[PDB]
């Protein structure tokens, strides 16, 4: 790109989070450990998510990168079996952080094998034998290729730089828009039995909302039933619901137009080990310029309002 920095003295930043994702999608995949003919085998098939920061900066001619990415990938393969042929399995590898000054022994790997059992004990030493050393050399080489590819995009060539200091440091009609979708997982300290009736019992709904207008005389919410919340500004309709497992609502704001109507999908993931419940909310149909508004208010009128009225978790 065109960078107007005489002698490369000012801080010019160039974000590379997009190229970083494309880099690992061409380097992490296809990496296998062992062989297909062998009794144990593992190979990465795809990258789950790449979140963090990846940016290159220059101050006085030195290409500086302070990237920090949390990489998660999915792996497949098979292990040895006592009876019959080999048994396939699936897993995932979680890396805490990939910094710029990380050493070979600094990279950590959280082993997450699906369907754990006693027969898959040789799954962890398998990836730690050949798969992990292959991931270490890629992460160490990621910093070198990043400075060599995007480093030349900044720091204009020395033929135009008259500074020996910085040189020594270089090496249609009117309508509306489309919709979108968000995903959040608020944690509640309440079993799915009481949390399910919280969104259905009209007596309990009025508690954490303090404003509701039910059109039917039913005790609790039923399928294909409309009701207005917050002075009639929030219009929701229960169209599908499972027993303490699924909740589907047709959320709609009064400010929205007619061709816009969102859908909330709530899934219960109560875990008796810690006595809590993770309510995975798959919210789709929100307008593009409205996803941040409904998400910030959902953590105020739905998440915190229930945890403070009924006490389903302490917040501070």
């Amino acid at each position: 790109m065109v960078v107007n920095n005489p002698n490369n003295w000012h801080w010019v930043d160039k974000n590379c989070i997009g190229w970083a994702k494309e880099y690992f999608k061409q380097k992490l995949v296809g990496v296998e450990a062992g062989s297909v003919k062998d009794k144990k085998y593992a190979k990465i098939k795809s990258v789950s998510s790449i979140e963090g920061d990846c940016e290159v900066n220059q101050r006085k001619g030195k290409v500086i990168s302070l990237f920090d990415l949390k990489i998660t990938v999915l792996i497949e393969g098979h292990v040895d079996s006592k009876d019959g042929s080999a048994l396939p399995f699936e897993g995932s590898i979680n890396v805490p952080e990939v910094a710029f000054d990380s050493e070979a022994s600094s990279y950590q790997f959280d082993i997450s094998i699906f369907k754990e059992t006693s027969e898959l004990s040789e799954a962890k030493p398998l990836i730690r034998s050949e798969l992990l050393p292959k991931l270490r050399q890629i992460f160490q080489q990621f910093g070198k290729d990043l400075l060599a590819t995007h480093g030349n995009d900044i720091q204009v060539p020395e033929s135009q730089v008259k500074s020996n200091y910085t040189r020594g440091n270089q090496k249609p009609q009117n309508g509306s828009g489309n919709s979108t979708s968000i995903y959040l997982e608020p944690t509640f300290n309440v079993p799915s039995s009481e949390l399910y009736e919280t969104f259905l019992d009209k007596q309990r709904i009025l508690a954490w909302t303090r404003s509701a207008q039910f059109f039917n005389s039913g005790p609790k919410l039923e399928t294909k039933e409309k009701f207005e919340l917050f002075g009639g500004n929030v219009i929701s309709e229960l169209v599908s619901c499972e027993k303490d497992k699924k909740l589907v609502f047709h959320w709609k704001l009064k400010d929205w137009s007619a061709p816009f109507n969102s859908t909330i999908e709530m899934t219960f993931h109560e875990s008796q080990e810690f006595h809590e419940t993770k309510l995975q909310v798959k919210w789709t149909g929100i307008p593009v310029g409205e996803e941040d508004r409904v998400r910030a208010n959902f953590e105020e009128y739905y998440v915190r309002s229930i945890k403070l009225t009924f006490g389903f978790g302490a917040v501070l």
Binding site: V2, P6, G175, G289, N297
Partner: protein
């Protein structure tokens, strides 16, 4: 001595206005939309004197067309446009503002308020673009092209290959490789909603569904209109635009101050507490909302915006410099909101929802603010023995005060049921004295700072205090206290350092004993509050000489039962029982339960 002139290093000054002139990079869109609104104001001012100027392109709009295939962010406006000379002087000279030069050439008393005053706002687009292709078209000139690559030179070429436009200016922003986020529908609507959401002219966005045009600024600003012509529905829609709240505003306070500090301000009071909130606008442009001296801390719940005009902005137009003027707007906001709160108090249904939702905020101002402490005390509402059903104010309290009462009596506690059945009310109810009820933890913090209301001193009945008494009772009480002197000395030796002193009190009727603070230390509720905060006194043993239990204990002392085992057990039992009624917490509650268990066994004939 030779007299030279100041020069400018173009190769280095441009870098100062391209690299480090704007903390954030999304500012380029705001300063380009603001430049488009200024051009629309110029052609609108000329249309009033010459209708032929607005005949080429009569529709005034601001169109944004993102192109992800070739990485071009097109921003088209139908303003006055720029000639070939204006592209060299107004768009080719640093710190040269043609808009400010147009404002100084207007007439006296103009109704147009343009934004461009500095002259370096156009160079913001280079933060995200490597080269810009400006296509301008004026009425008194041809269509030209202004190309530059953020360096030290630019090219002005006659337009002969692009589409012919009627009037205005088209900006083609070739975005960089890392700044491709501004080609999406999300980032475009995010910057406009944050910065240029209140542009007087409609902002059109070309969204790919087939492609359509959507108006980003759907809610027109209301601060440029009279508050009498604005209806209630317009205030509700305006509140849902300045804030992400879903509910309608409870009260709207729209005022206008004139003179040397002409500024508009529409303040909204929500129905629910948001637990900044007041945004600042200059020339229909959002500057910032991080002003901490504009609104007090206890008053930070009020929503709305403040559109001022005489504010010294920096080169980035996103923060304010120290000018000793924000304190003037601060006192005007508080003065109008206090006046607005008094208007809410005129109605019963409106003030009931306001007080129940912001009880902590109003009482916090009495503890924090001092200049308007008396005005905030007028809004304080609490329950009492004569107002168990509804809420009453401090003024209505003094109205119902008898002629022989000189102090405002109140009591604090955890809940309403605890203070309503408190044994401290029996003394004041006999004298026909009303006692307020304090249920919120912040109540005591407000009463410890007011200290007086209309000449009446605030006195807590939980602490030690003195009431009026007749001459016949004054002499009778002194005789009875002297007779119960050995009883008080016996209870003092049993408890030891648990109490400061044991005295005979006549302010108790049914309860045989009670504990008071001492009118100087922290009350039983205040001590419980401080010992229960997540982010973070001596006792007086008073007995009632008319209770049958106390009279039985008096008979034991005269019979030599000052060191009896049964007397000491009932002494510690009655003392810890009074702590539960006075609002104190029992230390080691297991020992207190053991005394109750032995009483139940005694009642069940257990040996």
């Amino acid at each position: 001595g030779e007299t030279f002139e100041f020069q400018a290093e173009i190769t280095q000054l441009m870098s100062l206005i391209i690299n480090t002139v704007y903390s954030n990079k999304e500012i380029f869109l705001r300063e380009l939309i603001s430049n488009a609104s200024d051009a629309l104001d110029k052609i609108r001012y000329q249309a009033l004197s010459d209708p032929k100027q607005l005949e080429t392109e009569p529709d005034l709009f601001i169109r944004i067309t993102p192109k992800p295939e070739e990485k071009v962010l097109e921003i088209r406006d139908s303003g006055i446009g720029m000639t070939k000379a204006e592209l060299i002087n107004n768009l080719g000279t640093i710190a040269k503002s043609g808009t400010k030069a147009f404002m100084e050439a207007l007439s006296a008393g103009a109704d147009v308020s343009m934004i461009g005053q500095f002259g370096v706002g156009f160079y913001s687009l280079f933060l995200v673009a490597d080269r810009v292709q400006v296509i301008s078209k004026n009425n008194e000139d041809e269509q030209y092209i202004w190309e530059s690559n953020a360096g030290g030179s630019f090219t002005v070429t006659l337009d002969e290959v692009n589409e012919r436009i009627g009037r205005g200016t088209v900006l083609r922003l070739f975005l960089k490789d890392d700044q491709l986020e501004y080609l999406e529908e999300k980032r475009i609507k995010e910057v406009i909603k944050r910065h240029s959401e209140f542009v007087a002219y409609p902002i059109q966005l070309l969204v790919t569904k087939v492609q359509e045009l959507e108006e980003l600024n759907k809610t027109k600003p209301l601060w440029t209109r009279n508050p009498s012509d604005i209806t209630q529905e317009e205030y509700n829609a305006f509140y849902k635009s300045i804030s992400n709240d879903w509910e309608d505003p409870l009260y709207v306070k729209h005022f206008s101050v004139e003179g040397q500090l002409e500024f508009r301000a529409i303040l909204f009071i929500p129905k629910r507490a948001p637990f900044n909130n007041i945004k600042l606008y200059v020339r229909r442009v959002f500057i910032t909302d991080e002003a901490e001296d504009l609104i007090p801390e206890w008053l930070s719940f009020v929503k709305g915006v403040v559109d001022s005009e005489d504010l010294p902005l920096n080169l980035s137009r996103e923060m304010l410099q120290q000018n000793k003027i924000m304190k003037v707007i601060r006192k005007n906001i508080v003065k109008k909101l206090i006046e607005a709160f008094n208007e809410i108090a005129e109605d019963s249904e409106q003030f009931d929802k306001f007080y129940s939702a912001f009880a902590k905020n109003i009482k916090l101002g009495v503890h924090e603010d001092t200049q308007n402490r008396a005005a905030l005390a007028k809004l304080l509402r609490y329950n009492s023995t004569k107002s168990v059903d509804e809420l009453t104010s401090l003024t209505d309290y003094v109205t119902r005060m008898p002629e022989h009462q000189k102090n405002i009596y109140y009591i604090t506690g955890e809940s309403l049921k605890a203070v309503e059945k408190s044994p401290f009310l029996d003394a004041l109810k006999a004298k026909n004295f009303e006692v307020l009820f304090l249920t919120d933890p912040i109540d005591e913090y407000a009463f410890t700072q007011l200290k007086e209301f209309e000449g009446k001193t605030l006195v807590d009945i939980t602490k030690d205090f003195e009431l009026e008494e007749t001459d016949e009772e004054k002499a009778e009480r002194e005789k009875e206290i002297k007779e119960y002197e050995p009883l008080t000395k016996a209870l003092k030796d049993i408890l030891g350092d648990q109490v400061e002193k044991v005295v005979v009190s006549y302010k108790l009727l049914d309860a045989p004993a009670a504990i008071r603070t001492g009118q100087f230390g922290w009350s039983a509720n205040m001590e419980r509050i401080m010992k229960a905060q997540a982010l973070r006194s001596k006792k007086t043993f008073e007995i009632s000489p008319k209770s049958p239990i106390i009279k039985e204990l008096k008979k034991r002392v005269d019979e030599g039962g000052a060191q009896d085992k049964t007397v000491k057990d009932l002494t510690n039992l009655l003392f810890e029982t009074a702590l539960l009624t006075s609002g104190f917490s029992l230390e080691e509650p297991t020992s207190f339960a053991s005394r109750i268990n032995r009483l139940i066994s005694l009642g069940l004939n257990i040996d």
